[PDB]
Each structure stands twice: as C-alpha cells, then as structure tokens.
Design a binder for this molecule. Sequence first.
Ligand SMILES: CC1(C)S[C@@H]2[C@H](NC(=O)Cc3ccccc3)C(=O)N2[C@H]1C(=O)O
Ligand SMILES: CC1(C)S[C@@H]2[C@H](NC(=O)Cc3ccccc3)C(=O)N2[C@H]1C(=O)O
Ligand SMILES: C[As](C)(=O)[O-]
Lengths: 137, 137
Amino acid sequence: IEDHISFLEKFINDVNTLTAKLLKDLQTEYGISAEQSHVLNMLSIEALTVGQITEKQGVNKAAVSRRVKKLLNAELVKLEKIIKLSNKGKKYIKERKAIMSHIASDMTSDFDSKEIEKVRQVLEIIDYRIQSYTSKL
Amino acid sequence: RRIEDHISFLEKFINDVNTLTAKLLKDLQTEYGISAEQSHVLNMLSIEALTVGQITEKQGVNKAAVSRRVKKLLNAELVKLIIKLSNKGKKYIKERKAIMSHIASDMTSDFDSKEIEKVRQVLEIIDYRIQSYTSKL
Ligand SMILES: CC1(C)S[C@@H]2[C@H](NC(=O)Cc3ccccc3)C(=O)N2[C@H]1C(=O)O
Ligand SMILES: CC1(C)S[C@@H]2[C@H](NC(=O)Cc3ccccc3)C(=O)N2[C@H]1C(=O)O
Ligand SMILES: C[As](C)(=O)[O-]
C-alpha cells in the first residue's frame, strides 16, 4: 500500500542496473553517460522543443539544456526549432533497442499477450496521471 | 517490435516516475542540503546498508562519482560509516515516504486492489527475472 511504492522503487533500481550492465560496452564506444544516453532514448520516442524536454526531464532546466547542447556537439542530435536525433543518434538507438528487446522478449516469452496487455493498461493510466500531476505545480 | 513497444513505454514510464519524484522532493532535498543523486544513494541505503563497491556497480557508474556523493553524505550526517543511515538520514527517508505515499495514494484510490495486485504480481516476476539475469551479468 506503501510497500507498493517501495517495490516500484526496487523494480526501477533493478531495471536501471540491468540496463547499465547490458549497455556498458555500447555507451563506452560512443563515450556517452547514461545521463546523456537517456535523453536520446527520450527523443527516440518523439521530437521535442528544447523547452518541452525540460518539462519531461524534470531536473534543472539548465542541466538538461547542457546535455542537449552536449549531444549537439557530438552531432548525435540535430535541429528542427525542434530537437531530433541525428542519423548517428538513430544508429545508437537501434543498437540500444536491439539489445533491450532481445533480453526483454526472453524474459516474457512464457507470458500470454493478454496478460501483458492488461498490466500495460493499468500502467498507462498511471503514466497518464503522473504526467498530469507533473504538468500542474 | 510488439515487445519493443513495451520497452519504450516502460522506458517512458520510468522516466516519468523519476521526473515526478524529483519535482516532488526538490524542497526536502534542499532543506537537508542534498542533491537528487545523493538522495538516491540514501533511498538505496534505506533498502539496506551497502558498501561503496555495491552502490557503484548497482547504479552502474564511474569511479570517483559514488565515493564523492558518499563523502558528502557522511559530512552532512545522514550516513554512518560498510555505510549506514543515521537518525537524521532515517528522518529524511521517512519524510520522503510520506510525500510519495500521499501522492501515490491519491493517484490510485479509485483502483481495484485486485487490479493493483495482479499488476504487482506480474512485475514481481519480472523483477525476480531481472535480478536473476543481472547475476549472470
Ligand atoms: C546547471 C547544471 C545542472 S548544468 C551545469 C554544468 N553541467 C555539466 O555537465 C558540467 C560539464 C560541462 C562540460 C563538460 C562536462 C561537464 C554543471 O556542472 N552544472 C549544473 C549546475 O552547475 O547547476
Ligand atoms: C539511474 C538513476 C538512479 S539516476 C536518475 C535520477 N537519480 C536520482 O537520484 C533521483 C532520485 C531522487 C529521489 C529518490 C531517488 C532518486 C533518477 O530518478 N534516476 C535514475 C535514472 O533513471 O537514471
Ligand atoms: C544531417 As544527419 C546527422 O540527420 O544525416
């Protein structure tokens, strides 16, 4: 009931650890922090204003702008002004998706699609509200 | 790509949760004189008293980093060197649970506890498989 909150934190921590482990080599090849790598994955989902990314990243606006500016200096991201992945940022994300999808489908292979669907619906509602809350104060 | 769609959504969901949390806890962190990342090491330590190496490979980050955050926490007296929490660190974690609890609660008080629980059940196995996978590396 609050232990649900604790569990979600444990789960997130573990996902993050797994990702950090599965993406170790790749992020070195590109010389990118998980911090930087995260924004690309973020932009991989859809384009974004530079002001919009600040809102969907939460921490200091200044921290996020520097990271975006840093991904521009590396030419992994490009302009319109909107911010989108460069052809190079795109190749990185394909390799990232390649790995993540590989293990992800290994881990859910005994799951019937309809079990995952219903679980995904409930999380979407929660993702929705999370975003609305985030939108307000 | 069916699954690949589920990872993207999962990636977006986790980023949204982290963004909310950061916004929700910014003042408490500031009141205790710490940064988000320091507060993170603190929540982990609430899970259990871990040593330096443990917190480094878990979060999956470089050398100086973790140690640096831990030196700052021990100078702020929120930790007790192993590395454990202190009455003041324990107080912070408590204040954080309360905030996260009211918020999680008011964002899920219309759900079926049977609905929340089949969801928790599916995620616990995925956490369990993530965890057993991370052992292999
Ligand atoms: C506003 C920020 C969140 S962003 C600013 C800067 N960010 C960096 O990453 C420092 C840096 C610059 C170039 C290369 C490496 C690191 C730095 O450090 N930063 C933060 C601050 O001082 O409040
Ligand atoms: C790998 C991380 C643990 S670092 C990023 C940020 N870190 C934090 O410490 C935020 C935080 C605030 C309060 C309690 C826990 C974590 C946060 O949230 N984080 C995870 C991420 O998605 O990268
Ligand atoms: C101009 As480009 C880095 O999107 O091929």
